[PDB]
Amino acid sequence: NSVAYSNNSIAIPTNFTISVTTEILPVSMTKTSVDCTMYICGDSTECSNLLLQYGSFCTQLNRALTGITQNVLYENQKLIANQFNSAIGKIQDSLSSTASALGKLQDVVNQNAQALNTLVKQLSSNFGAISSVLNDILSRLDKVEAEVQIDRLITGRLQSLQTYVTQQLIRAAEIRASANLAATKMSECVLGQSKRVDFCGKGYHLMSFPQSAPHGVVFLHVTYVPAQEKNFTTAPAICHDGKAHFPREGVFVSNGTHWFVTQRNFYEPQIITTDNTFVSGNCDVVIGIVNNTVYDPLQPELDSFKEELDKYFKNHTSPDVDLGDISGINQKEIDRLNEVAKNLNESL
Amino acid sequence: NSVAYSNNSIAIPTNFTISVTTEILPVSMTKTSVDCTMYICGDSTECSNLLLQYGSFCTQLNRALTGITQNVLYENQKLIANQFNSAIGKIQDSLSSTASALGKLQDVVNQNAQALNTLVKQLSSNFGAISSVLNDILSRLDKVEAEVQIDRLITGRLQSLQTYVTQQLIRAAEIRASANLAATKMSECVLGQSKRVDFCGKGYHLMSFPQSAPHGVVFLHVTYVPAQEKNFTTAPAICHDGKAHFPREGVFVSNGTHWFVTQRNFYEPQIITTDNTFVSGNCDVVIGIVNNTVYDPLQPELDSFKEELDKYFKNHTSPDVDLGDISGINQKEIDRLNEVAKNLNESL
Amino acid sequence: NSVAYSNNSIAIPTNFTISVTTEILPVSMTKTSVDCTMYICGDSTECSNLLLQYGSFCTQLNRALTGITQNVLYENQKLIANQFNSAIGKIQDSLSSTASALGKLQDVVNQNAQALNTLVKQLSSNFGAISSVLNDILSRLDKVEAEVQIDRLITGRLQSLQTYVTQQLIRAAEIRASANLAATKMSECVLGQSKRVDFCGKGYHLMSFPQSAPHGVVFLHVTYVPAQEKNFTTAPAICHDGKAHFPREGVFVSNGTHWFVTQRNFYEPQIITTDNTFVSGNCDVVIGIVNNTVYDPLQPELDSFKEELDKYFKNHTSPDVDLGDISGINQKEIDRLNEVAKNLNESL
Numbered sequence A, B, C: 001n002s003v004a005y006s007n008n009s010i011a012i013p014t015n016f017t018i019s020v021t022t023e024i025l026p027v028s029m030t031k032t033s034v035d036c037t038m039y040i041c042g043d044s045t046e047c048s049n050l051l052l053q054y055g056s057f058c059t060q061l062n063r064a065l066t067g068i069t070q071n072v073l074y075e076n077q078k079l080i081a082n083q084f085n086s087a088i089g090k091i092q093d094s095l096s097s098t099a100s101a102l103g104k105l106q107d108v109v110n111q112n113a114q115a116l117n118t119l120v121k122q123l124s125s126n127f128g129a130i131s132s133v134l135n136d137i138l139s140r141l142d143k144v145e146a147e148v149q150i151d152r153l154i155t156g157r158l159q160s161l162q163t164y165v166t167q168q169l170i171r172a173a174e175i176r177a178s179a180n181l182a183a184t185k186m187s188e189c190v191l192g193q194s195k196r197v198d199f200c201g202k203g204y205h206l207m208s209f210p211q212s213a214p215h216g217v218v219f220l221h222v223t224y225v226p227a228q229e230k231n232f233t234t235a236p237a238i239c240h241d242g243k244a245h246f247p248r249e250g251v252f253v254s255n256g257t258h259w260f261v262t263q264r265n266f267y268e269p270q271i272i273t274t275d276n277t278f279v280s281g282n283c284d285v286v287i288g289i290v291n292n293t294v295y296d297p298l299q300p301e302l303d304s305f306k307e308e309l310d311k312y313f314k315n316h317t318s319p320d321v322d323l324g325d326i327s328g329i330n331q332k333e334i335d336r337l338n339e340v341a342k343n344l345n346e347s348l
């Protein structure tokens, strides 16, 4: 017998004051379209120019927000002439061979001088070619290493603009429920005298007069409130000798000695009769349970970043460049000939 | 005494026509799961292959959407022989030294020819090595400079798909409120005869019959509407000699000469009595104010992009490459020897 | 005459059991603020350090979530001496010219040896310079080609965190409607005895007692339910000789032989009278239609990726590097002089 037969002090309205309410309801959201350049980048021209390659995403966000003795002296004469004549013929061999040698040395040394001037003109081409191609690699790699950090910050400002767009769509879907509230609250109270307490102005309703506002309706409700209420002990029902008895359109207001079915909203007692009450059987309480569970979504739970990264990274290190190490490739006769050019006159 | 005692013409229902309403309510959203490749990239294979490195984000979005004288002639003979014998010994010195010199020149010139063929084989290695390593740097840098612009456009299409997912979750959270409206509107009108005007069909309610639809309920409401209404002047209350008097379940319909408490929803006058009215004291109006402020969120306001960028940029420019400038490193005797090889026979 | 005059079996309440309901309503959401590092990257330090360059986007998401014979022998003596004296003067020319030649060969060969040691010291500089500058280009390009795949996965985890933030704002905008439901459901039932069936506990309302819970209100409703109901055939209205007749606060309960206006919620018949019914004219049914179309947004439809890419791509291929092709730049007299240095003694 838990609570259905407990008696507790309940306030029941004892007189009235006449009153009026001004109640303001908004009935209509202006389309807060966003320029996506000025939001994300603003004045800063390098990121602005990057925004064009993010495509027409800005428009896409605005679709959302815009909606919503003579013999031996003579034989010595034969002898010395035969020694001389044979010597000079050996001088001509000695000298002709030296000319044929020194003329092959002067050939090959000038062919070497030609080869080195060929090498210098070709290597001037290589250090000139590498000057231009490697200056361009340097100048363009400096541009590309300036440009992946600005995209990083644009992409984190994209999320700030997507939080802007979400909170601006969220509010517009509350506004469209407040326009449904303005529809039911217009209908039931401008087209319809209510018997509900505090709907259509504080207290109890007499009459109303709507007036417009720029995006709203305002109601003048004429109503009466309780100027003066008393706590009567009560029960919702009473179980006499195993039968439960309970009101019809009232409560059991409790007098010191008797039960009366007062109207819930006023102290005006009337006697228990089979026309003021209903009746039951066996004196039992039915117990009901209601639990208004408002949706808890499937939130997007993820692996640790190491697992979702390692699924698809290559730690490729290019080798230390080694190339060819070219450091590993490593007068007396003219004095005499000048001396004997003089000292041969001592044998003239 | 603002509005509670003003009298204005109010329409009060004068006859009825019987009527029926067909009212359609949707009570149930099909799970619009999205393939994230086909949405963002479509057929285009280079961006498709990039999508795999964005991780399983697609699934994460689908968790959401799937939820929700003889002596001097002889001394001259001694003399000339002594001059000749001494001269030839000086010829052998002159010639042996020239051979030892010209044999050191032919040694060193062929050691130079060896060194230059060593240099050409090592430099053929360097321009062949740099050919391959620098072609790869060129060929791969062209690939990497093709691949940061396609990620830009994928990342702006991600926001278009996140606006898709947000508007598809927003609608599903309206659908779940329309399924709560279908619960109260089923209960109060299929299980319960309403005393409300225009709830359960135009006019006043008699009876109803629900019928299903594929994702909805449809009600046949049987109701009566006012076929024919008259404007009576009225007041919500009247203050006689400093006491306010007001109805009980009606309005003061105003006849040319008397006040009657008509029922709000019909013209049927009844006389003012203490059983048709309540009464007050001192003739004052209570004024109430209600302002139904619907949530305005903390929207994500940001610095200018220059401040949020400059927090974390280095304008490093690599110097213009300069390297070594190798352009800054800059027969008559054989004719005679051929001539005296002939002209020495003139002294044979 | 479609449905307004059809008669069908309707259940009308025949006794009561007293009952109590416990009804639980949540009235208040704890601020689930998110550390954005631990959500997206977690422990993994390389992506963590990247998060700083995405800016204070994390804060921006937390603004949202924290809200919400002697002569001829002598003439031969003159002759041979004149031949010898003239020959030696031609030897001095032959030898002085050879010295002046061989001294220009020994000059130019050592000037060549100087030029090649100059070349090797300058080229040691070039292969040393290119060693350092090209090792840095290799070492830094390896760093930059490691650093665009981790940003890809951060940017797809950003969308997972933006789905988290959207579903956490969506739920908080349902919570703020459930706090409006707790306001009306507190007011009409703690401050006000309802005449509605199943609002304020199963059945019909007597009385109630609210009790708090940590984020909720719980109502004890005392109510009566129907312990025991009978199907009477009925019509909502009847059209006698071309006039439609219909109840006032009841239904036409159908007895075997007569029509009675029973109260909708109880079987208790009363006779048709002009005080139990309203009356009409011409016997016609008005037909009304109501179609409660719940917002279907402008969803962000996009071109194919090829069109939105091609608006802003350059397929620049750098040419195959060609450079200078240096492979296209391509003892007997000392034996004799050693032989005649010996064989000239045969003419001493």
Ligand SMILES: *[C@@H]1O[C@H](CO)[C@@H](O)[C@H](O)[C@H]1NC(C)=O
Residues within 6 Å of the ligand: A005, A006, A007, A233, A254, A255, A256
């Ligand atoms: C209800 O109140 C009356 C007096 O007001 C008292 O006599 C009675 O015992 C109370 N009911 C219960 C169950 O105590």
Ligand SMILES: *[C@@H]1O[C@H](CO)[C@@H](O)[C@H](O)[C@H]1NC(C)=O
Residues within 6 Å of the ligand: A015, A228, B279, B281
């Ligand atoms: C309450 O109303 C009654 C009924 O007329 C009246 O007699 C009584 O004086 C009123 N109370 C006050 C405080 O005015």
Ligand SMILES: *[C@@H]1O[C@H](CO)[C@@H](O)[C@H](O)[C@H]1NC(C)=O
Residues within 6 Å of the ligand: C005, C006, C007, C233, C234, C254, C255, C256
């Ligand atoms: C309504 O029911 C009665 C008997 O209950 C029957 O005589 C009458 O014909 C029914 N109405 C119609 C239109 O059939």
Ligand SMILES: *[C@@H]1O[C@H](CO)[C@@H](O)[C@H](O)[C@H]1NC(C)=O
Residues within 6 Å of the ligand: A279, A281, C015, C228
């Ligand atoms: C229903 O109520 C009546 C009225 O007192 C009673 O006579 C009847 O026995 C009750 N029915 C049951 C099954 O108790």
